[PDB]
Symmetry: D2
């Protein structure tokens, strides 16, 4: 509960949660919502928690400090998972001044509908004295991931409250990074970036470059989700630079949907052709109807190339492929190559429309693979050869 | 097990099945696969069963008749749920002649890869004598629902083996229509047509008109799924004509997806505005992430108008909406009106792209509804008014 | 929104909800939460809504009437789906007197932890004048379904606010029973009683007998879930008497779990043996792993007999069967007969323990059916014969 | 495809599979089925594949070798996932002699119903010459995991075909252990043992001791699921000894079910009390209704102690807890301690029956924790204290 000195974690662990953003981001290891109470000469509260825990939040905050003793409230991000307990709290201390970006005023009002609250706009470099020789330095970070996002730096203790950035949805009773299981931790960090931060990778390097340019010490990075980076904090920062640079491993992801397993047979063959041709490559196969969507996108993120599959259904693609291609267009993956494939009954046409959309999504397209009905021994030889040819074209230098 | 005289049901009931066409058609009441053995002077087998039951099928067929005694095999439709036990059967009696459409030869080979089988092409009006003054009259029905589809008429007994047409996925131990629960039966008939036959409605009336033009008596209609229409057979035929004529009731369906329930609030308000304005209208609301997709499409089929909802996510629609719009484009609903709506955070743009695609799908578009963040009391008044205005524009004549 | 005269519906429709009591009661047609505002000389609020809609509730109540104008609050049932918006409301009007049973004081405090609230204990026959010649007559109904449950009768308008009783989870924009789809309505009424009220059937007839013994007119029955019974109200009352009397139709339900489909094959055979022997009987088969649990229990409720299936796994039953038998023990079905069956590999023992527990649950047991590994043609003949023998033993009089 | 010298992998990768043993074992990374063709002077086939891939299996085996050239068939285990393609294969070469345990004859017949097949019973130490100075030495391993289980040792090449043992459900295009991701590999090995092999741990050490007592070299261990242990084979053997010895880490697992989140609140508090008292302990919390069951059991396996939770529902436990306790009784965990807890409304009684059953399952019981309705601040202090007290009682020596 105690982060460092007079900084107190007053957040909420959520072991049961599985759905975020509707069902667009599934969290298989639950999550946590970090809120930090800093008490020097001035008592300042940094962010709240998910709206589902508003009652537990206020009550727990009472057991920590009398509400009237809170001087300032800092809101880095106005999304419901961080500002959901704000209305219930401001109902007890309505006159308390809030500090946020100009855009946050727009987003906070859009959620809580209380424009009378004492908002105080802050910009990059702005400071807020809190006594004892310590102050809060604000750093705007628009579109990382919302127009309203920012970060708060605490002088002296050298703590960077980054909110969503550098966070991960991984529920644990221990607070610090060196206290949890390392593999599960990093698997969750990468899952987060790939499914939410990918479309804004271009802003990451310049932003991180700017922050470092302030020559500020960082003993800890305290995110709004998961662990506090206490042990070797820049650790997670180095990763974000790596991830933001059109990241890719020697990996190929293959996903598809199928009605009678014909496209599946093509997928399996293509894989065998790849694994047989280039041993360095790690291959993954997924049925979009029977798989975790976020796991597919994480792999895609980690991949140098992708093969998407679909049969023709009513002159169009299959719904789950159409939807998954829509999401990829939004995530805008970069410097990746792709190939479409599928089976059909008579007129077909789904592989062609799938191929065009993959290209508009930003993928560098290779030749498509097409089969009629169920691939017989001859057709399967073609599918394996397609796997080999793809493996040669995409092969990394020796 | 006995249908009529020397016609024996030798199919397979499937109580456990939930998924068809991958997961594109969910069957909540299971299904059945009808195969009919006709024994006069010639023993003829009409269709087989799903590939998953190939072992049980052959064995049960042995207990009915020695395989060598089967003279002819009739294949109306070469989809795996009806011809899946064909390879395992033809391995015992390889020389047995098969009767089907020219397209069926292409589709059967595409599945079983046995081009050596003794195929015999049949066309509309063709006959196959089976002794005792009875014969089989074939009726081609391409694209109902496959290019290979046809129907078989048995003279004397006046039995029409229609295969998929007039069928429904409803598992019951009783075979005849008058023996099962009527409401569940018809609910399943309508669910079938809406999710599979809608795109081919234009072919239904001419086809049914043609068959009736043959002046043939019909004592029974024996489909490949579900009950045998024994009691008042034309019953289901009258329905298909009704359904094929751009069918619609005084009903409005509203579906959407949402990340923080903002679009949900708009949907609820719109509904209240409709119900309050026009009591004749039946309203339905669905969250595509939390609902049965086939149930949504059935309602859409039954509806005169639709309101589709979505928020903006990464400059695009939400995946499940994009996918569901893709499927509707394929099903090609006709003479229906629609309206797009949704919330957004800053730039938006998802409602506009949703509206265009709905139009390209064949919907007559009305004004869109847009809100920013969470709709406050003022915004909610607009959403209800949108419901009222829509209800007036779409209202049926007094 | 207007029920009758000065009685105003101020509840909340819930189209999206699927889970109740964790996941023990799935609601496939959503639900609604009814709250009624009665305004004569005294303004009285009857129940609130689900805690998830506390914000929308208070706000909507403001748009209806100023909170200070509310004189009394009536709480028939203190479960979260009806009293979840009570804390948020009492925070605005803390001095407002509450009327409930003695047990409700215990249950309301156990949820809200505000023992200072002005509680007023009421008993059967107690009245509360509200002006204009009208008063509220209270009727305690403990264990229907909670120790705290009661009903409120409004004189003059003749409205019986029964809360949970006579309700159903069926979300619709129309409020009155004669305005909704009748089949869906009754299907939901029966689903409710079977899954929640079965264990307390013995209390239903005496309670309903008592209420009628008050010689009070009932123009409407306004439940807390779903429609208001406006058209022929006693309709639903007659049903409850029917349902409470160890209800059963000429129906047999068969459910089981299976690892390799051996027990499934036995189930299918048994069914064929039943349907072949006694045509009057309606048969239903369910795989507990692939089916809606509440649908299974509804059928069981409607059934005269049950056949539960399971294979032996690690010397014990299968989990989902063990769990489902645990729930049945709690629901305490009466005057029903049952038979256990299943397959095993070597030592077995699961059918025997399943049979004993079914008996302790209150089922009158018949002979068990046992098979080793996969039932061959001989074993299948035994399984069908078991179906026939069961069908004869349980047959209703001619 | 080539394992070593004249040993050819001819199995089947299954990327899509999610369900095993009905739904009792969920496989989130798919699986594979290993079949090995050994060709010296005698051509011998070791096991087949899952029945779902019988067609692909035979066909692929044809492309490898003419069926008539197969001299012997070895069946280590007669479960459908390894002998499912046996009927379809024996239909082509009916006279081929089969080698298996006496119990396998019983289990193979129970599945395939072909008692005429040329079975040849083998016992531990039995040999089967295959030419070129190499022979097959058989090692019976009853109840690991079936009465029919055995292992086959190939002289010269020093390959131990262990079947299920040492296997894992982890689908990959690479065959050898040193070629796959190590963490995912071991996570799957442990998941397998915990969910299937736990009840037979007592037989593992004596069996492995016996095999090593034969003084046979092992260059490779070729299982029937997943990778071939090529690099440091004894690796997985050392683990099994570790796992079989009533394995436990410094870990505590907490699972429960809940209807209104009361028991959840108790669970969260207990955890906080543990983490606060003993930092060495890793804590895990699961909602049985919202979690992967196999993941829960894996943790339980890894745990020194467990806290199971449940509220009272209809005088009994909650179904999913009852079912999960039934399965644990079957898995028979050893040398673990446990504590029951839960909330109730009036009479309660579920915690007491849960506690007794946990004890009969083999857990050493601690004091139970009980609360009424929703735990207020006082009750929560008790729940945390319960966490502390448990943490002290179960603490490992300094
Ligand atoms: C509902 C349905 C609709 C179909 N629509 C088309 C179509 O529009 N054009 C076409 O060429 N084939 C169509 N087909 C045939 C399939 O594309 C063909 O069977 C294909 O081989 C199946 O591929 P899959 O098993 O990998 O899903 C359709 C099949 C089904 C079941
Ligand atoms: C992951 C994510 C991506 C978003 N992308 C956009 C966007 O590209 N443009 C925009 O205007 N708003 C965007 N938003 C803001 C949402 O559209 C806004 O919060 C909206 O009110 C939510 O609607 P809903 O709760 O009905 O889903 C995004 C929100 C999230 C969570
Ligand atoms: C994981 C597992 C555990 C088993 N445990 C037992 C057992 O304890 N006693 C027994 O006689 N058979 C046992 N069996 C064998 C099964 O009961 C046998 O295969 C049965 O026919 C399967 O029935 P089902 O396919 O209907 O589920 C077990 C099988 C499996 C897969
Ligand atoms: C359907 C149902 C049945 C119940 N049955 C009992 C009961 O038999 N005995 C009892 O003391 N409480 C009973 N209760 C009350 C609950 O046990 C009580 O609300 C408890 O605090 C809920 O715990 P949970 O939210 O953790 O699930 C029942 C509650 C429900 C909803
Ligand atoms: Fe965020
Ligand atoms: Fe966040
Ligand atoms: Fe079809
Ligand atoms: Fe069909
Ligand atoms: Fe209730
Ligand atoms: Fe209720
Ligand atoms: Fe096995
Ligand atoms: Fe196995």
């Amino acid at each position: 509960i105690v982060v460092k000195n007079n900084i107190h974690w007053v957040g909420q662990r959520d072991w049961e949660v599985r759905d975020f953003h509707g069902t667009e981001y599934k969290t298989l290891r639950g999550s946590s919502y970090n809120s930090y109470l800093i008490r020097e000469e001035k008592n300042v509260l940094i962010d709240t928690v998910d709206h589902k825990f508003s009652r537990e939040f206020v009550q727990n905050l009472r057991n920590e400090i009398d509400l009237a003793d809170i001087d300032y409230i800092v809101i880095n991000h106005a999304e419901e998972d961080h500002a959901g307990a704000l209305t219930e709290l401001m109902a007890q201390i309505p006159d308390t001044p809030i500090y946020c970006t100009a855009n946050a005023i727009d987003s906070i009002n859009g959620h809580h509908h209380h424009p009378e609250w004492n908002f105080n706009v802050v910009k990059t470099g702005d400071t807020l004295d809190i006594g004892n020789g310590k102050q809060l330095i604000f750093v705007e970070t628009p579109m990382l991931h919302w127009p309203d996002s920012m970060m708060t730096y605490l002088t002296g203790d050298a703590v960077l409250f980054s909110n969503d950035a550098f966070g991960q949805h991984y529920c644990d009773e221990h607070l610090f990074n060196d206290e949890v299981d390392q593999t599960e931790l990093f698997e969750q960090c990468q899952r987060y970036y790939a499914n939410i931060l990918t479309p804004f990778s271009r802003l990451v390097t310049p932003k991180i470059t700017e922050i470092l340019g302030f020559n500020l010490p960082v003993d800890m990075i305290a995110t709004s989700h998961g662990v506090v980076w206490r042990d070797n904090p820049t650790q997670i920062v180095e990763l974000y630079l790596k991830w933001a640079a059109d990241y890719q491993e020697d990996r190929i992801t293959i996903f598809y949907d199928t009605m009678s397993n014909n496209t599946r047979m093509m997928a399996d063959a293509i894989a065998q052709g790849i694994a047989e041709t280039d041993p360095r490559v790690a291959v993954k196969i997924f049925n979009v109807a029977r798989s975790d969507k976020n796991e597919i996108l994480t792999n895609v993120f980690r991949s140098k190339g992708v093969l998407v599959g679909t049969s023709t259904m009513n002159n169009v693609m299959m719904p789950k492929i159409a939807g998954l291609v829509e999401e990829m267009t939004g995530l805008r993956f970069r410097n990746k190559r792709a190939s479409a494939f599928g089976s059909h009954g008579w007129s077909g046409g789904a592989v062609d429309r799938l191929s065009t959309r993959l290209q508009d999504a930003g993928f560098e397209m290779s030749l498509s693979l097409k089969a009629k009905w169920r691939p017989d021994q001859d057709a399967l030889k073609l599918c394996r050869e397609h796997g080999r040819e793809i493996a040669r074209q995409w092969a990394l230098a020796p």
